[PDB]
Amino acid sequence: SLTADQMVSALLDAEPPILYSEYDPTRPFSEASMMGLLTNLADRELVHMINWAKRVPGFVDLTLHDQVHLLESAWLEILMIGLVWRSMEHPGKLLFAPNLLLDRNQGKSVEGMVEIFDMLLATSSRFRMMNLQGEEFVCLKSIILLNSGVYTFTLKSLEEKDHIHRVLDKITDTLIHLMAKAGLTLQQQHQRLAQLLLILSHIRHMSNKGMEHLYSMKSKNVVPSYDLLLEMLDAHR
Amino acid sequence: LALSLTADQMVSALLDAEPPILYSEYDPTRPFSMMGLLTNLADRELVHMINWAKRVPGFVDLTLHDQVHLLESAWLEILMIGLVWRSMEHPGKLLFAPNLLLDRNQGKSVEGMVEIFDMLLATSSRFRMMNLQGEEFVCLKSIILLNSGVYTEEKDHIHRVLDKITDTLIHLMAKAGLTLQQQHQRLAQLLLILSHIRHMSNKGMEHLYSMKSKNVVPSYDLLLEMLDA
Ligand SMILES: CC1=C(c2ccc(O)cc2)[C@H](c2ccc(OCCN3CC[C@H](C)C3)cc2)Oc2cc(O)ccc21
Ligand SMILES: CC1=C(c2ccc(O)cc2)[C@H](c2ccc(OCCN3CC[C@H](C)C3)cc2)Oc2cc(O)ccc21
């Protein structure tokens, strides 16, 4: 029932905070410590992501089961687009945190990492060339949340999918509204809409390559479990 | 040059450039290697894909080097969307060839295959649900060709062609009688399906690699030879 303006306002209000890496001026940054710091940040960002997701219009209208499925599908894509967004104004660097700004040479320290760094930096550059606006960014991130898991899900399921498609349609309306307000021609509007949504194909690509890379590290866990996501999502009262 | 085409001229060019549907190489008199059949078919399909790519307006304006890199990035996605397209009118089945229609039970035959089968089937179902038209299909396939490798003067040209295809898609929908709102909603719906096709190609590549076959990706030299400089 939201208007385009109401949709933008809700998404902007729902934005999670930018988190920091730990501070210590007695411990100089080490290559050996890098993955540990990144993991610690990612895990903390995930908790805020679940909060954010619950504030995306239409998301909590879904079953808890399907909310979990959508986050299972989208969580790394969402981490990545978030990273690319806060890195946009910093050519050649990834702003994992304001006190953890890394370049591709530092990425070389971890086997297989520089390939993923390069893809993320390329996305940052693309954002920059398009002059991506914050209002557009929060629309794109919401689209990832709703769309990424919708092809891999009963009567209830059909109802859910119809709802997701209607919300996705409203976000399309919202993007078009924003561009119309920016003074773009109708032609420029459709063209930019297309340009923006094609970036999501690259973000999906990066998530899949990234997931493969994280698994190759043979750590205890990579993905947040169904259990964990449910626990974070399945709040009482 | 090819950017000077009208929307109608663009559509006609793409429709005319469509590759043929090939047959599986087996003797139908004999008892029914699935991956063997599929690999043989994919490899033959690839040749026709390269000749199709050369007819996508704007593609051959790129350097041969860049043409090859786009094909390197896009070939599996393009195989997949073509498979989904010809499987649309066959619910629950994948029409790999007219003489090779497989259902998901058949897919189980091969380890790790049914997961990718189900994704392909879901895409075919989505196409049918959206009543995807042939004119839209050829635009989407062209977008995959130009977009899949663009992150890995030339880039400006690629974006110009992509913008032209967007114009063409919107033109088709307007002609179909859709309102402006329906036009940009349907455009978005179609482009979001492309992210799923990318996903499928990613998981498909993982699966093909896990089989530890001889090769998986076509070499630079193979693609370049097919391009016939
Ligand atoms: C994009 C990205 C990272 C990354 C690094 C390599 C790679 O192949 C894919 C993602 C790494 C990264 C990403 C995900 C990681 O998963 C650790 C396992 N956690 C994830 C959630 C679950 C509770 C367990 C560990 C490190 O760092 C980031 C931190 C952020 O706050 C936001 C994005 C990242
Ligand atoms: C989608 C698809 C196939 C497939 C099966 C499992 C999988 O994990 C990914 C793709 C299999 C398939 C797809 C690609 C294959 O690559 C074999 C290696 N070739 C590819 C080109 C290069 C010259 C070497 C082998 C089998 O069959 C198809 C045949 C088609 O004419 C069109 C699409 C396919």
Coordinates of C-alpha atoms and ligand atoms in Angstrom, one line a residue:
Chain A
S1 CA 0.0 0.0 0.0
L2 CA 3.1 2.2 0.3
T3 CA 3.7 5.0 -2.1
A4 CA 7.1 5.2 -3.8
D5 CA 8.1 8.0 -1.5
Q6 CA 7.0 6.0 1.5
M7 CA 9.0 3.0 0.3
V8 CA 12.2 5.1 0.0
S9 CA 11.7 6.7 3.4
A10 CA 11.2 3.3 5.0
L11 CA 14.2 1.7 3.4
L12 CA 16.4 4.7 4.3
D13 CA 15.2 4.6 7.9
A14 CA 16.0 0.9 8.1
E15 CA 19.6 1.2 7.0
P16 CA 22.0 -0.6 9.4
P17 CA 25.0 1.2 11.0
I18 CA 28.6 1.2 9.7
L19 CA 30.6 -1.0 12.1
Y20 CA 34.3 -0.7 13.1
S21 CA 37.1 -3.2 13.3
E22 CA 38.8 -3.4 16.7
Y23 CA 41.1 -0.5 17.7
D24 CA 44.6 -1.0 19.3
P25 CA 47.5 1.2 18.5
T26 CA 49.8 -1.3 20.0
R27 CA 48.9 -3.9 17.4
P28 CA 50.0 -3.0 13.9
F29 CA 47.9 -4.5 11.2
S30 CA 49.1 -8.0 10.2
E31 CA 48.4 -10.0 7.1
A32 CA 48.0 -13.0 9.3
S33 CA 45.2 -11.4 11.2
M34 CA 43.2 -10.2 8.2
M35 CA 40.7 -13.0 7.7
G36 CA 40.0 -13.1 11.4
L37 CA 39.1 -9.4 11.3
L38 CA 37.0 -9.8 8.2
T39 CA 35.1 -12.7 9.7
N40 CA 34.5 -10.8 12.9
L41 CA 33.1 -7.9 11.0
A42 CA 30.9 -10.1 8.7
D43 CA 29.5 -11.9 11.7
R44 CA 28.6 -8.6 13.4
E45 CA 27.1 -7.2 10.2
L46 CA 24.8 -10.2 9.9
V47 CA 23.0 -9.4 13.1
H48 CA 22.2 -5.9 11.9
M49 CA 21.2 -7.4 8.6
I50 CA 18.5 -9.5 10.1
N51 CA 17.1 -6.4 11.8
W52 CA 17.2 -4.5 8.6
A53 CA 15.5 -7.3 6.7
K54 CA 12.5 -7.2 9.1
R55 CA 12.1 -3.6 8.3
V56 CA 12.0 -4.1 4.5
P57 CA 8.3 -3.5 3.6
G58 CA 6.6 -6.8 3.0
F59 CA 9.3 -9.1 4.4
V60 CA 7.8 -10.0 7.8
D61 CA 4.5 -10.7 6.0
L62 CA 6.2 -13.9 4.8
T63 CA 6.4 -17.1 6.9
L64 CA 9.4 -17.3 9.2
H65 CA 10.5 -20.4 7.1
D66 CA 10.6 -18.3 3.9
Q67 CA 12.3 -15.4 5.6
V68 CA 15.0 -17.8 6.6
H69 CA 15.2 -19.1 3.1
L70 CA 15.5 -15.6 1.6
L71 CA 18.3 -14.7 4.0
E72 CA 20.1 -18.0 3.4
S73 CA 20.2 -17.2 -0.3
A74 CA 21.0 -13.5 -0.1
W75 CA 23.2 -12.9 3.0
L76 CA 26.6 -12.8 1.2
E77 CA 25.2 -10.7 -1.7
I78 CA 23.9 -8.2 0.8
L79 CA 27.2 -8.1 2.7
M80 CA 28.9 -7.5 -0.7
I81 CA 26.7 -4.8 -2.0
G82 CA 27.0 -3.1 1.4
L83 CA 30.8 -3.3 1.1
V84 CA 30.8 -2.0 -2.4
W85 CA 28.5 0.9 -1.5
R86 CA 30.7 2.2 1.4
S87 CA 33.8 1.6 -0.8
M88 CA 32.4 3.7 -3.7
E89 CA 34.2 7.0 -2.8
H90 CA 37.5 5.3 -2.3
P91 CA 39.1 4.3 -5.6
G92 CA 41.3 1.2 -5.4
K93 CA 40.2 0.2 -1.9
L94 CA 37.6 -1.8 0.0
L95 CA 36.3 -0.1 3.1
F96 CA 35.5 -3.1 5.2
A97 CA 35.4 -0.7 8.1
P98 CA 36.4 2.9 8.4
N99 CA 39.6 1.6 10.2
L100 CA 40.0 -1.4 7.8
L101 CA 40.6 0.0 4.3
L102 CA 42.3 -2.6 2.2
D103 CA 43.8 -2.7 -1.3
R104 CA 44.3 -5.6 -3.7
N105 CA 47.9 -6.1 -2.6
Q106 CA 46.8 -6.8 0.9
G107 CA 44.3 -9.1 -0.6
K108 CA 47.2 -11.2 -2.0
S109 CA 48.1 -12.4 1.4
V110 CA 45.2 -14.8 1.5
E111 CA 45.2 -17.5 -1.1
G112 CA 42.4 -17.0 -3.7
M113 CA 41.4 -13.6 -2.1
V114 CA 42.7 -11.2 -4.8
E115 CA 40.3 -12.6 -7.4
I116 CA 37.3 -11.7 -5.3
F117 CA 38.8 -8.3 -4.2
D118 CA 39.1 -7.5 -7.9
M119 CA 35.5 -8.2 -8.6
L120 CA 34.4 -6.1 -5.7
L121 CA 36.6 -3.2 -6.7
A122 CA 35.2 -3.4 -10.3
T123 CA 31.7 -3.2 -8.8
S124 CA 32.7 -0.1 -6.8
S125 CA 34.1 1.4 -9.9
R126 CA 30.8 0.7 -11.7
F127 CA 28.8 2.4 -8.9
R128 CA 31.1 5.4 -9.2
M129 CA 30.7 5.7 -13.0
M130 CA 26.9 5.5 -12.6
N131 CA 27.0 7.9 -9.7
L132 CA 24.8 5.6 -7.7
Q133 CA 22.6 7.4 -5.2
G134 CA 21.8 6.2 -1.7
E135 CA 18.1 6.0 -2.5
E136 CA 18.9 3.7 -5.4
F137 CA 21.3 1.6 -3.4
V138 CA 18.7 0.8 -0.7
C139 CA 16.2 -0.2 -3.4
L140 CA 18.8 -2.6 -5.0
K141 CA 19.7 -4.2 -1.6
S142 CA 16.0 -4.8 -0.9
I143 CA 15.6 -6.4 -4.4
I144 CA 18.4 -8.8 -3.6
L145 CA 16.8 -9.8 -0.3
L146 CA 13.5 -10.6 -2.0
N147 CA 14.6 -12.0 -5.3
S148 CA 17.7 -14.1 -4.8
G149 CA 16.0 -17.0 -3.1
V150 CA 12.6 -16.9 -4.8
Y151 CA 13.4 -19.5 -7.5
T152 CA 14.7 -22.1 -5.0
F153 CA 11.8 -22.5 -2.6
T154 CA 2.5 -25.6 -1.8
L155 CA -0.5 -23.4 -1.7
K156 CA 1.1 -21.2 0.9
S157 CA 4.3 -21.1 -1.2
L158 CA 2.3 -19.8 -4.2
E159 CA 0.8 -17.1 -2.1
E160 CA 4.2 -16.1 -0.8
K161 CA 5.7 -15.9 -4.3
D162 CA 2.8 -13.7 -5.5
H163 CA 3.4 -11.4 -2.6
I164 CA 7.2 -11.2 -3.2
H165 CA 6.5 -10.3 -6.9
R166 CA 4.1 -7.6 -5.9
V167 CA 6.7 -6.0 -3.5
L168 CA 9.4 -6.3 -6.1
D169 CA 7.1 -4.5 -8.6
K170 CA 6.6 -1.7 -6.1
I171 CA 10.4 -1.4 -5.7
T172 CA 10.6 -1.1 -9.5
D173 CA 8.0 1.7 -9.3
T174 CA 10.1 3.3 -6.6
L175 CA 13.3 3.3 -8.7
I176 CA 11.5 4.8 -11.6
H177 CA 10.0 7.4 -9.4
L178 CA 13.4 8.4 -8.0
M179 CA 14.9 8.7 -11.5
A180 CA 11.9 10.7 -12.7
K181 CA 12.4 13.1 -9.8
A182 CA 16.1 13.3 -10.7
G183 CA 14.9 14.8 -14.0
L184 CA 15.9 11.9 -16.2
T185 CA 13.9 11.4 -19.5
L186 CA 11.6 8.4 -19.8
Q187 CA 14.2 6.8 -22.0
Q188 CA 17.0 7.5 -19.6
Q189 CA 14.8 6.1 -16.8
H190 CA 14.4 2.7 -18.4
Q191 CA 18.0 2.6 -19.5
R192 CA 19.3 3.3 -16.0
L193 CA 16.8 0.9 -14.4
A194 CA 18.3 -1.8 -16.7
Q195 CA 21.8 -0.8 -15.9
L196 CA 21.1 -1.0 -12.2
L197 CA 19.4 -4.4 -12.3
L198 CA 22.2 -5.9 -14.5
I199 CA 24.7 -5.1 -11.7
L200 CA 22.7 -7.5 -9.6
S201 CA 23.8 -10.3 -12.0
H202 CA 27.4 -9.4 -11.2
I203 CA 26.7 -9.3 -7.4
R204 CA 25.1 -12.8 -7.7
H205 CA 28.3 -13.9 -9.5
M206 CA 30.5 -12.5 -6.8
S207 CA 28.5 -14.2 -4.0
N208 CA 28.8 -17.6 -5.7
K209 CA 32.6 -17.2 -6.3
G210 CA 33.0 -15.9 -2.8
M211 CA 31.0 -18.8 -1.2
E212 CA 33.3 -21.2 -3.1
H213 CA 36.3 -19.3 -1.8
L214 CA 35.1 -19.3 1.9
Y215 CA 34.5 -23.0 1.7
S216 CA 38.0 -23.6 0.4
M217 CA 39.4 -22.2 3.7
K218 CA 38.2 -25.2 5.6
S219 CA 36.9 -23.1 8.6
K220 CA 34.3 -24.6 11.0
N221 CA 31.4 -22.7 9.3
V222 CA 30.8 -20.5 6.3
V223 CA 27.0 -20.0 6.0
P224 CA 24.7 -19.0 8.8
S225 CA 22.7 -22.1 9.7
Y226 CA 19.0 -22.3 9.3
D227 CA 19.0 -22.6 13.1
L228 CA 21.0 -19.4 13.6
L229 CA 19.0 -17.3 11.1
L230 CA 15.7 -18.6 12.5
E231 CA 16.9 -17.8 16.1
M232 CA 17.8 -14.2 15.0
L233 CA 14.6 -13.8 13.0
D234 CA 12.3 -15.8 15.3
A235 CA 12.1 -13.2 18.1
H236 CA 9.6 -13.5 21.0
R237 CA 7.1 -10.9 21.9
Chain B
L1 CA 26.6 1.7 -37.6
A2 CA 24.5 -1.1 -36.0
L3 CA 23.5 1.4 -33.3
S4 CA 21.6 3.3 -36.1
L5 CA 19.1 0.5 -36.4
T6 CA 15.5 1.2 -35.3
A7 CA 13.9 -0.9 -32.6
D8 CA 12.0 -2.9 -35.3
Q9 CA 15.2 -3.4 -37.3
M10 CA 17.0 -4.6 -34.1
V11 CA 14.3 -7.2 -33.4
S12 CA 14.2 -8.5 -37.0
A13 CA 18.0 -8.8 -37.0
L14 CA 18.0 -10.8 -33.8
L15 CA 15.1 -13.1 -34.9
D16 CA 16.9 -13.8 -38.2
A17 CA 20.1 -14.6 -36.3
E18 CA 18.5 -17.3 -34.3
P19 CA 20.5 -20.6 -34.2
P20 CA 19.0 -24.0 -35.3
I21 CA 17.8 -26.7 -32.9
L22 CA 20.2 -29.6 -33.0
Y23 CA 19.6 -33.3 -32.4
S24 CA 21.3 -35.6 -30.0
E25 CA 23.8 -37.9 -31.6
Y26 CA 22.6 -41.4 -30.8
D27 CA 20.8 -44.3 -32.5
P28 CA 17.2 -44.4 -31.5
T29 CA 17.0 -48.1 -32.3
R30 CA 19.4 -48.9 -29.5
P31 CA 19.0 -49.2 -25.8
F32 CA 19.0 -45.8 -24.0
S33 CA 26.0 -42.0 -20.9
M34 CA 23.7 -39.1 -20.3
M35 CA 26.6 -36.7 -19.7
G36 CA 28.2 -38.1 -22.9
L37 CA 25.1 -37.2 -24.9
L38 CA 24.8 -33.8 -23.2
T39 CA 28.4 -32.9 -23.6
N40 CA 28.3 -33.9 -27.3
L41 CA 25.2 -31.7 -27.8
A42 CA 26.6 -28.7 -25.8
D43 CA 29.8 -28.8 -27.9
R44 CA 27.9 -28.7 -31.1
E45 CA 25.5 -26.0 -29.9
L46 CA 28.5 -23.8 -29.0
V47 CA 29.5 -23.6 -32.7
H48 CA 26.1 -22.2 -33.7
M49 CA 26.2 -19.9 -30.7
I50 CA 29.4 -18.2 -32.0
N51 CA 27.9 -17.7 -35.4
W52 CA 24.8 -16.2 -33.7
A53 CA 26.9 -13.9 -31.6
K54 CA 28.5 -12.4 -34.8
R55 CA 25.1 -11.3 -35.9
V56 CA 24.1 -9.5 -32.7
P57 CA 24.2 -5.9 -33.8
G58 CA 27.3 -4.2 -32.3
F59 CA 29.2 -7.4 -31.3
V60 CA 31.7 -7.5 -34.2
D61 CA 32.7 -3.9 -33.7
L62 CA 34.6 -5.1 -30.7
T63 CA 38.1 -6.5 -30.9
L64 CA 38.4 -10.2 -31.5
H65 CA 40.1 -10.4 -28.1
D66 CA 37.1 -8.8 -26.4
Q67 CA 34.6 -10.9 -28.5
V68 CA 36.3 -14.0 -27.2
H69 CA 36.3 -12.9 -23.6
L70 CA 32.6 -12.1 -23.8
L71 CA 31.9 -15.6 -25.1
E72 CA 34.2 -17.1 -22.4
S73 CA 32.0 -15.5 -19.8
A74 CA 28.6 -16.0 -21.3
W75 CA 28.6 -19.4 -23.1
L76 CA 27.0 -21.5 -20.4
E77 CA 24.4 -18.9 -19.5
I78 CA 23.5 -18.7 -23.2
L79 CA 23.3 -22.5 -23.5
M80 CA 21.0 -22.5 -20.4
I81 CA 18.6 -19.8 -21.5
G82 CA 18.3 -21.5 -24.9
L83 CA 17.5 -24.8 -23.2
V84 CA 14.9 -23.1 -20.9
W85 CA 13.3 -21.3 -23.9
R86 CA 12.8 -24.5 -25.9
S87 CA 11.6 -26.3 -22.8
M88 CA 8.8 -23.8 -22.0
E89 CA 6.0 -25.7 -23.7
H90 CA 7.1 -28.9 -22.0
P91 CA 6.2 -28.6 -18.2
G92 CA 8.4 -30.7 -15.9
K93 CA 10.8 -31.6 -18.7
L94 CA 14.0 -30.3 -20.3
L95 CA 14.1 -30.4 -24.1
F96 CA 17.8 -30.8 -24.6
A97 CA 17.0 -31.9 -28.1
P98 CA 13.8 -32.9 -29.9
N99 CA 15.0 -36.5 -29.4
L100 CA 16.3 -35.9 -25.9
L101 CA 13.5 -34.8 -23.5
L102 CA 14.5 -35.5 -19.9
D103 CA 12.6 -35.2 -16.7
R104 CA 14.0 -34.6 -13.2
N105 CA 13.9 -38.3 -12.4
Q106 CA 16.3 -38.9 -15.3
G107 CA 18.5 -36.1 -14.0
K108 CA 18.9 -38.1 -10.8
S109 CA 20.8 -40.5 -12.7
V110 CA 23.9 -38.3 -12.5
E111 CA 25.2 -37.1 -9.1
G112 CA 24.6 -33.5 -8.4
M113 CA 22.6 -33.1 -11.5
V114 CA 19.0 -32.9 -10.1
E115 CA 19.8 -29.7 -8.3
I116 CA 20.7 -28.0 -11.5
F117 CA 17.8 -29.7 -13.4
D118 CA 15.3 -28.3 -10.8
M119 CA 16.7 -24.7 -11.2
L120 CA 16.4 -25.0 -15.0
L121 CA 12.8 -26.3 -14.7
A122 CA 11.9 -23.5 -12.3
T123 CA 13.2 -21.0 -14.9
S124 CA 11.2 -22.6 -17.7
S125 CA 8.1 -22.4 -15.4
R126 CA 8.8 -18.7 -14.8
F127 CA 9.1 -18.1 -18.5
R128 CA 5.8 -19.8 -19.1
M129 CA 4.1 -17.9 -16.2
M130 CA 5.3 -14.6 -17.7
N131 CA 4.3 -15.6 -21.2
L132 CA 7.8 -14.8 -22.4
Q133 CA 7.7 -13.9 -26.1
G134 CA 10.3 -14.8 -28.7
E135 CA 11.2 -11.2 -29.4
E136 CA 11.9 -10.7 -25.7
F137 CA 13.9 -13.9 -25.5
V138 CA 16.3 -12.9 -28.2
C139 CA 16.8 -9.5 -26.5
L140 CA 17.6 -11.2 -23.2
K141 CA 20.0 -13.6 -24.8
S142 CA 21.8 -10.7 -26.4
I143 CA 22.0 -8.9 -23.1
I144 CA 23.7 -11.9 -21.5
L145 CA 26.3 -12.0 -24.3
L146 CA 27.2 -8.3 -23.8
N147 CA 26.8 -8.1 -20.0
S148 CA 28.2 -11.3 -18.6
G149 CA 31.9 -10.4 -19.2
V150 CA 31.8 -6.6 -18.9
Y151 CA 33.3 -6.6 -15.4
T152 CA 36.3 -8.8 -16.2
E153 CA 36.1 2.9 -25.9
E154 CA 35.2 -0.8 -25.9
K155 CA 33.2 -0.7 -22.6
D156 CA 31.4 2.5 -23.8
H157 CA 30.4 0.7 -27.0
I158 CA 29.1 -2.4 -25.0
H159 CA 27.0 -0.1 -22.8
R160 CA 25.6 1.7 -25.8
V161 CA 24.5 -1.6 -27.4
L162 CA 23.0 -2.7 -24.1
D163 CA 21.1 0.6 -23.8
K164 CA 19.8 0.0 -27.4
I165 CA 18.5 -3.4 -26.4
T166 CA 16.8 -1.9 -23.4
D167 CA 15.1 0.6 -25.8
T168 CA 14.1 -2.3 -28.0
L169 CA 12.6 -4.3 -25.1
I170 CA 10.6 -1.3 -24.0
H171 CA 9.5 -0.8 -27.6
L172 CA 8.2 -4.3 -27.8
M173 CA 6.2 -4.0 -24.6
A174 CA 4.7 -0.7 -25.7
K175 CA 3.6 -2.3 -29.0
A176 CA 2.1 -5.1 -27.0
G177 CA -0.2 -2.5 -25.4
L178 CA 1.4 -2.4 -21.9
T179 CA 1.1 0.7 -19.9
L180 CA 4.3 2.6 -19.0
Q181 CA 4.1 1.1 -15.5
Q182 CA 3.7 -2.4 -16.8
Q183 CA 6.6 -1.8 -19.2
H184 CA 9.1 -0.9 -16.5
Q185 CA 7.8 -3.6 -14.2
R186 CA 8.1 -6.3 -16.9
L187 CA 11.6 -5.0 -17.9
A188 CA 12.6 -5.4 -14.3
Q189 CA 11.1 -8.9 -14.0
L190 CA 13.0 -10.1 -17.1
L191 CA 16.3 -8.7 -15.9
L192 CA 16.0 -10.2 -12.5
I193 CA 15.6 -13.6 -14.2
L194 CA 19.0 -13.0 -15.7
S195 CA 20.5 -12.9 -12.2
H196 CA 19.0 -16.4 -11.7
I197 CA 20.5 -17.6 -15.0
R198 CA 23.9 -16.3 -13.8
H199 CA 23.4 -18.2 -10.6
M200 CA 22.6 -21.4 -12.5
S201 CA 25.7 -21.0 -14.7
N202 CA 27.8 -20.5 -11.5
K203 CA 26.4 -23.7 -9.9
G204 CA 26.5 -25.5 -13.2
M205 CA 30.2 -24.7 -13.7
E206 CA 30.9 -26.0 -10.1
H207 CA 29.0 -29.2 -11.0
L208 CA 30.7 -29.7 -14.3
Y209 CA 34.2 -29.1 -12.7
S210 CA 33.3 -31.6 -9.9
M211 CA 32.9 -34.3 -12.6
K212 CA 36.6 -34.1 -13.2
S213 CA 36.1 -34.5 -17.0
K214 CA 38.8 -33.8 -19.6
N215 CA 37.9 -30.1 -20.0
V216 CA 35.0 -27.7 -19.1
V217 CA 35.5 -24.3 -20.6
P218 CA 36.2 -23.7 -24.3
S219 CA 39.7 -22.4 -24.8
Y220 CA 40.5 -19.0 -26.1
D221 CA 41.9 -20.6 -29.3
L222 CA 38.9 -22.7 -29.8
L223 CA 36.5 -19.7 -29.6
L224 CA 38.8 -17.6 -31.8
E225 CA 38.9 -20.3 -34.5
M226 CA 35.1 -20.6 -34.4
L227 CA 34.9 -16.8 -34.9
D228 CA 36.7 -17.3 -38.2
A229 CA 38.8 -14.1 -38.4
Ligands
LIG1 C1 32.8 -9.4 1.1 C2 33.3 -9.8 2.5 C3 34.3 -10.8 2.7 C4 34.6 -11.9 1.7 C5 35.9 -12.3 1.6 C6 36.3 -13.4 0.6 C7 35.4 -14.0 -0.1 O1 35.7 -15.1 -0.9 C8 33.9 -13.7 0.1 C9 33.6 -12.7 0.9 C10 34.9 -11.1 4.2 C11 34.1 -12.1 4.7 C12 32.8 -12.4 4.3 C13 32.0 -13.6 5.0 C14 32.6 -14.3 5.9 O2 31.9 -15.4 6.6 C15 32.4 -15.8 7.8 C16 31.3 -16.9 8.4 N1 30.2 -16.3 9.0 C17 29.4 -15.6 8.1 C18 28.0 -15.6 8.8 C19 28.0 -16.8 9.6 C20 27.5 -16.5 11.1 C21 29.5 -17.3 9.7 C22 34.0 -14.0 6.4 C23 34.7 -13.0 5.8 O3 34.6 -10.0 4.9 C24 33.6 -9.2 4.8 C25 33.2 -8.5 5.9 C26 32.0 -7.6 5.8 O4 31.6 -6.9 7.0 C27 31.4 -7.5 4.7 C28 31.8 -8.2 3.5 C29 32.9 -9.1 3.6
LIG2 C1 22.5 -26.8 -19.4 C2 23.2 -27.9 -20.1 C3 24.0 -28.9 -19.5 C4 24.5 -28.8 -18.0 C5 24.3 -30.0 -17.2 C6 24.8 -30.0 -15.9 C7 25.4 -28.8 -15.3 O1 25.9 -28.8 -14.0 C8 25.6 -27.7 -16.1 C9 25.1 -27.7 -17.5 C10 24.7 -30.1 -20.3 C11 26.0 -29.7 -20.5 C12 26.3 -28.4 -20.6 C13 27.8 -28.0 -20.8 C14 28.8 -29.0 -20.9 O2 30.1 -28.6 -21.2 C15 31.0 -29.7 -21.8 C16 32.3 -29.0 -22.0 N1 32.3 -28.3 -23.3 C17 31.6 -27.1 -23.2 C18 32.2 -26.3 -24.4 C19 33.6 -26.7 -24.4 C20 34.0 -26.9 -25.9 C21 33.7 -28.0 -23.7 C22 28.4 -30.5 -20.8 C23 27.1 -30.8 -20.6 O3 24.0 -30.1 -21.5 C24 23.5 -29.1 -22.1 C25 23.4 -29.2 -23.5 C26 22.9 -28.1 -24.3 O4 22.8 -28.2 -25.7 C27 22.5 -27.0 -23.7 C28 22.5 -26.9 -22.2 C29 23.1 -28.0 -21.5

